[PDB]
Every structure is written in structure tokens, then in C-alpha cells.
């Protein structure tokens, strides 16, 4: 009673109605800090191998921070309108680039390593100091790295320093590996426990707090982080997390398959597909449409998506799933004249657009070919099948738990007749196709009528 | 002892991450396909309670064997890295409550070299939504 599927043979499409929405309708900034060291150049007249190892670790840190210094930033689906993803994080970083704020933040983070602070620009942020380099470089090496008496026989010193250093070393590596702008953000930028604390300490609802505290595995792919500053003794870098202002809304996915007439002639065929495959999630009384499935992700029953690849479509667009011909909303489709075979993957099955003469088949691992189709839009579930072959592609079927419904109906392609139809339409719709057909009929008849 | 504890806690954060990440022009008409159907389907077959005990029993002696899952399609499984040994019979008998005499430094070195593999496994699980391509060598040497 949570997820299921229904496939309409009326226009040859599948609907997976079980997933629960997770829309990042808000952003959230958090400036993390790591207390650096303006180390004075090391100096030991006389080389012990442990001393050389300590020197090499310090020099590796120095190359890390030199790198960081130099990197301180010194088919429908084509009308969405792109957006500046990194605007908020780099805007906060810019707010930091004003001279005074860094001392304020450092003072606010002197005692603890987590605090809510108000920047110069008014919007409150939450900041961390996860790794402290000043302590373990000042009061653990300098008192024991004296000029001449470089007695560092304790080997484990270098091991502790390396374990407390590799985190920031990978931070600088990722700064230099992703143009200072990376997604996902690795744990060396924010430890998972630190992430849980951040989610628990930020201003969102308790249900959303639990929701985003236990759902890390997708957030990183919906998160971002650019460098802010090394201004004074500290490495400060912003993180951009989501804020689910829309939750607990039942939203679904739409998969598409061509309809065609099935004349024995391989050529002169007429084919129609629904060009609206993607995601529909309900937020504010109208659906949110993601055209390209590369902007949405799946987690069991929670689908996590970013709305910046979304439009808001009227709720009447849902009626395009029952009657594509209704005039309430002009459903979007694409027409073409090429006859070839293929199949598409729904949540619990696959739609075989078996066109031409390819030997399409549905089978299970241990049974083999159990069903053979015949030249047309057909659908098969996942229940007893996990291998559908068309031509030479052998697709698997996701074996999630659900109930499959198959609505019979005469394909609309039957209504469309050849010899008049236009053989080129991708951004077309029902209304546009009908208008063009009426225009062609009027021209043909008036040309004949005038006789 | 501090270093040993830090390594153990790093492993514990790795496995906490693993726990929390549990997953249940022409060229436009091809028809996309489910890449992860087979792997996650086999995983789901594993999520049935009984199979893991059988798999463990079949991999008790060696670290490579062909086993038949509950779903019928035979699979082949390894046990490339063994954390139970080096955490059971080579730290616990030498990590007693009070007599934490671990003067031998190379204990931590050996544990780290036998741990970093699974540490990278969990990192990649959390770096690619538990779904990555290519698979790094720490997933299969």
C-alpha cells in the first residue's frame, strides 16, 4: 500500500506512484573552520631520521597550504532556465572576505567548535572548528622541536600529527581537484558525526531534523562547498546543504514508450511517444516537473531531487495520465516516422516497444524465454520476469515490491491516419498536431474544392 | 594506546556510515535501462535473513566459492579482507582493560594496513550514493 505501478496502453506509458518527495526548496550555508598555523621555518642542525620525517610532514602541510593560497579563488527539458548553484556559498565567503569578520568568528569559536554567528550581511550562519592545527603545531612541536635539541625519539609524534593532518591535506587536495568547488563533499570536509550535529543544530523542523539527520547518503550529492578564506590563522570554507520546505508529499515517476501502427511494411510507419518522461512531485497545489532523470535520485521510497531542474505545472497535467486528448491541459508528445525497436524501464517492469521485426522476449533467470511479443507496444512486469531482450540488449527489471496494473485501451495512433501526417515533431503536443492536421486537410480540400 | 583507540574509532565511524547508508541528431529514441537492477536484486536476495549465515559458512575455510542464493541464480563470493581475526585474537587478548601493554608499535601499523581497505570501501559507499563506477581496488584487489 506504499508503492505500485500502473501502465496505460492508451498512450503507452508507465507511472510509478510510490516514492515520497524530498525537494530542496531552500538552501543553508555553514562556514566550517580549521585553526591553521603560520609555522616559523623549522631548523635542526643535525639530521635524525625521525626529525626528517617530522620535517617532511611539516613540508607536506606547507605545500598543502601553498596550493590552497594559490587556489583562494584569486525531447522536452531544454527550457528550464539554469541557476547559479554556488551563489550562496561564495556570497557568504565574500562576506567573510571583509577584513573584520574573521576575528569575530575566531573569537566566537575560541571555546567550542560549533556556534551560530551573524555575519556582516545579516543572514545568520552556523560555523564549526573541526580540526585544530594551532594546538598540535604550537604546543606539541615547538617546545619539542628546539633549534639544536631536536630530541624527537618519540616516533608516535609523527603518527599523531599525520592523523590530525591528513584531513586538511585531503581538504586542500579536493580544493585543487575540483576547482575549489566539489560535489559531493568528502568526509574530510565534514565528518559524518559532525554532519549529524550540524543537522540537529540548524533551524529546521523536528520531523525535518530527523529526516535530514538520517539521510546523509544523498545530501552530499545535493551539497556543495567552495573555499572562503585563509585570512588569519584559519582555513574557512563554506558548505551548502538543503532545506526541505516540501516533505511528506506522495510523488511519482513517468516513463514513456512509442505508439505506432503495425503495418507489415518496415518503412512508411507512423510513431508517437509521450515526451514528458521524468518526475512529478507535489509541493504547493501544482506539480513539479523534472524533465531529465539526471536531476533526481532514489532511496527505497524517498526520492531526493533538486528543484532547479523543475518547472511548476498545473495539477490538471495529472489528467494527461488518463486522457491525453482532454483540452484542459495540452499534453506534450513527439512524433516520428522511423520504425525501430526498443524498451524502457518502469519501477516494477519494462515496456517493450517491439517495432520492426526484432525478436523481443521476456524471461526469468532460471526459466528462459517465457513470453514472446508481436510487433507493438506491450508491457511486462517484474513479478516473474527479470530479463527482457530486444534486438541484442538484455535489460534487467528492478525487483522492488509492488502491485502492477495494466489499463487496456486503443492507442491514439489508430486515430491518426497516414498520407497527411507531418513526419517531424519533437516539441509537439495534441493541440499542435491537431491544428497542423486540420491545416493540411483544409489545404487539400480547398485545392480540390476549387475545381 | 591512544593511536589504537583512534584507529578503532575511525573504523567505528566507517561502519556507522555503512549502517546509515542502507539502500533498499539521432540518439534520443534508444530507451534507457536499469543498470543497478541485477546487483541490488542480488543484494535484496541477501536481505533475506537466512542467506548470510549460509554464505558465511560456505566462506569459513577459503575466501572464494560458488554459492547458490535463495533466488536460484548461482553467484560467486569472496572474503578478501578479514576484520574479525585481527580485531579478536590479535588486539583483544593484548588490549586488556587495565594491562594495555601495547608497546609494540607495529600493532597499529598492521591494523591500519588491514583497515584502510574497508575504510575506503565505506568512504566510496558515502561518496557515490553507495553506487559507484568505476569500482576502486579496495572493493576488489
Amino acid at each position: 500500500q506504499n508503492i505500485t505501478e500502473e501502465f496505460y496502453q492508451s498512450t503507452c506509458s508507465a507511472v510509478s506512484k510510490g516514492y515520497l518527495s524530498a525537494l530542496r526548496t531552500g538552501w543553508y550555508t555553514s562556514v566550517i573552520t580549521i585553526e591553521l598555523s603560520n609555522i616559523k621555518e623549522n631548523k635542526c642542525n643535525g639530521t635524525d631520521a625521525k626529525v626528517k620525517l617530522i620535517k617532511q610532514e611539516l613540508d607536506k602541510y606547507k605545500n598543502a597550504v601553498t596550493e590552497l593560497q594559490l587556489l583562494m579563488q584569486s525531447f522536452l527539458g531544454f527550457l528550464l532556465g539554469v541557476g547559479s548553484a554556488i551563489a550562496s556559498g561564495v556570497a557568504v565567503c565574500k562576506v567573510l572576505h571583509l577584513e573584520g569578520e574573521v576575528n569575530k568568528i575566531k573569537s566566537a569559536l575560541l571555546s567550542t567548535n560549533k556556534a551560530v554567528v551573524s555575519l556582516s550581511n545579516g543572514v545568520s550562519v552556523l560555523t564549526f572548528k573541526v580540526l585544530d592545527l594551532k594546538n598540535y603545531i604550537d604546543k606539541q612541536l615547538l617546545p619539542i622541536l628546539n633549534k639544536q635539541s631536536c630530541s624527537i625519539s618519540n616516533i608516535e609524534t609523527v603518527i599523531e600529527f599525520q592523523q590530525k593532518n591528513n584531513r586538511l591535506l585531503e581538504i586542500t587536495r579536493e580544493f585543487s581537484v575540483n576547482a575549489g568547488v566539489t560535489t559531493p563533499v568528502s568526509t574530510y570536509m565534514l565528518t559524518n558525526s559532525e554532519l549529524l550535529s550540524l543537522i540537529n543544530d540548524m533551524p529546521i523542523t523536528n520531523d525535518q531534523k530527523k529526516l535530514m539527520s538520517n539521510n546523509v547518503q544523498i545530501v552530499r550529492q545535493q551539497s556543495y562547498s567552495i573555499m572562503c578564506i585563509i585570512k588569519e590563522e584559519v582555513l574557512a570554507y563554506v558548505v551548502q546543504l538543503p532545506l526541505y520546505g516540501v516533505i511528506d508529499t506522495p510523488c511519482w515517476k513517468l516513463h514513456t514508450s512509442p505508439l505506432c501502427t503495425t503495418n507489415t511494411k518496415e518503412g512508411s510507419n507512423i510513431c508517437l511517444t509521450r515526451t514528458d518522461r521524468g518526475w512529478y512531485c507535489d509541493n504547493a497545489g501544482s506539480v513539479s516537473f523534472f524533465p531529465q532523470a539526471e536531476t533526481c535520485k532514489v532511496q527505497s521510497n524517498r526520492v531526493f531531487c533538486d528543484t532547479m531542474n523543475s518547472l511548476t505545472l498545473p495539477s490538471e497535467v495529472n489528467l494527461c495520465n488518463v486522457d491525453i486528448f482532454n483540452p484542459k491541459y495540452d499534453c506534450k508528445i513527439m512524433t516520428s516516422k522511423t520504425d525501430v525497436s526498443s524498451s524502457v524501464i518502469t519501477s516494477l517492469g519494462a515496456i517493450v516497444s517491439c517495432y520492426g521485426k526484432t525478436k523481443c522476449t521476456a524471461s526469468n533467470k532460471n526459466r528462459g524465454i517465457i513470453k514472446t511479443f508481436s510487433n507493438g507496444c506491450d508491457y511486462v512486469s517484474n513479478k516473474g520476469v527479470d530479463t527482457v531482450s530486444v534486438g541484442n540488449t538484455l535489460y534487467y527489471v528492478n525487483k522492488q515490491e509492488g502491485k502492477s496494473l495494466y489499463v487496456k485501451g486503443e492507442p491514439i495512433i489508430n486515430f491518426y491516419d497516414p498520407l497527411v501526417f507531418p513526419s517531424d515533431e519533437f516539441d509537439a503536443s495534441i493541440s499542435q498536431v491537431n491544428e497542423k492536421i486540420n491545416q493540411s486537410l483544409a489545404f487539400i480540400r480547398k485545392s480540390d474544392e476549387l475545381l | 594506546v591512544k593511536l589504537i583507540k583512534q584507529e578503532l574509532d575511525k573504523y567505528k565511524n566507517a561502519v556507522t556510515e555503512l549502517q546509515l547508508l542502507m539502500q533498499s541528431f539521432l540518439g534520443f529514441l534508444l530507451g534507457v535501462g536499469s543498470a543497478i537492477a541485477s546487483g541490488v536484486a542480488v543484494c535484496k536476495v541477501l536481505h533475506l535473513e537466512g542467506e548470510v549465515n549460509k554464505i558465511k559458512s560456505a566462506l569459513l575455510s577459503t575466501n572464494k566459492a560458488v554459492v547458490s542464493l535463495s533466488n536460484g541464480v548461482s553467484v560467486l563470493t569472496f572474503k578478501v579482507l578479514d576484520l574479525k581475526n585481527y580485531i579478536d585474537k590479535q588486539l583483544l587478548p593484548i588490549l586488556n582493560k587495565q594491562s594495555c601493554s601495547i608497546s609494540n608499535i607495529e600493532t597499529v601499523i598492521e591494523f591500519q594496513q588491514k583497515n584502510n581497505r574497508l575504510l575506503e570501501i565505506t568512504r566510496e559507499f558515502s561518496v557515490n550514493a553507495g553506487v559507484t563506477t568505476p569500482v576502486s581496488t579496495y572493493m576488489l584487489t
Partner: antibody
Amino acid sequence: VQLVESGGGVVQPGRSLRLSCAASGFSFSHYAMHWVRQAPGKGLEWVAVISYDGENTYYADSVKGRFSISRDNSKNTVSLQMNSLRPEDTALYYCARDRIVDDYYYYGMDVWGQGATVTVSS
Amino acid sequence: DIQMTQSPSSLSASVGDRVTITCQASQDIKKYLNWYHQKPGKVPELLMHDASNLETGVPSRFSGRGSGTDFTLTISSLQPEDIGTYYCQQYDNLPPLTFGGGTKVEIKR
């Protein structure tokens, strides 16, 4: 991986009966469930197989319609209702797990239980 | 309905001997057959499935071969625990499923 039976008894011909099957220790949720019967000192012949979900059911032709198979996920339970009993249905019954997971197209039976004897006679 | 005849109806041998049991199907089945054990006074135990794939947890002495309508079960060296009754079952692409007539196995004195 345990299966036990309850309700097994005796009744005169033409009277309804129920057999309950209780499973433990394995995925009772992902598997198709079988019932088989064997008369004492005789060979097997199939009784019925209920799909993993309880939607699709299949029966033996000689007992088609007489049997009514049900399965409850909440009670971790299977049940067989026997209506219009005949004298020749006397036998020991085994409730069994299928050999493959959540498979509409059925296979043999892998995990069986002790079995419940049912006798019918005037 | 699919009808499967098993032969011989009853059989006897001695410890260490070899036995062969045949199971014939009414109509053609590619490889869809299983061989079942049933020890005396116990629940039936599934020897092997698909007529050539053993059920793990059992000795390798049992073997299954055949195709089409005819399948064969061969035991190389009998053991006293091997007594009881052997059966064959089919799952050819659809129900109804069906069991065989039976082959009893005991020993002489």
C-alpha cells in the same frame, strides 16, 4: 527455518476444516508457499501452491474449488480451508517453503515441517 | 494434466550397490524436474533440483541426468540410510505441479 502445523484432526465427510501453518526463522515474506498431501503408506500428489503475495493461487485439478488457500503476513501464518471433504482425502499434509524467492512460476519445495495427519470417515 | 510415471514401482538392493530409477513425463519438458528423497517415518527431503543440480548439504553419491521426457537418478554406492522412497516432480513452465508414483528402497538378508 522451522515450519509447524496446527488444527490437524478428524471430521466426518462433507464438513469444513482448517489447517494452520506457522513459519519461523526465514523470509516468509519473499517466498511462495506450498501444501502437499500423502496418504499413509502411499506416494505424494500435489495439493496447492499459493503465491508469495496471496494474489495468485493454484490448486490440483482433482481438488479444484474444494480448497481455499490464504496467507497472512501480519500473523506470519498460512492457512488451508478444506470444504466438501471426501473420504479419499485422508492423508498426512506437509506445509513447505518454495525453492526460489518470490517466484510466480513455481518450483519444488525445499523446507518442510513435521506434517499434520488428517483423517476423514463416517 | 501432466502425468509422470516412475519406474520401477519398488526396488531392493544391498549396501554398496548401484541403482538407477527412471521418471518419464507425458509431454516434453526441457530440464524442469527434481528428484526427492523420503526417509521412512520422516519428511520428504529434496535430493536435487533441475534434474542435474544437487541440493547442497547432501552427499555427492546421488546423480541426475536426462532430458526431454525421460530423466534418470543414479546411486553408485548404496548406504543403509539411503533406504526409504524416491520420487520425481516437475515444474514445466506452469502449474499444476505433480509428484511421481514412487520407488521404494529396502535391503535383503
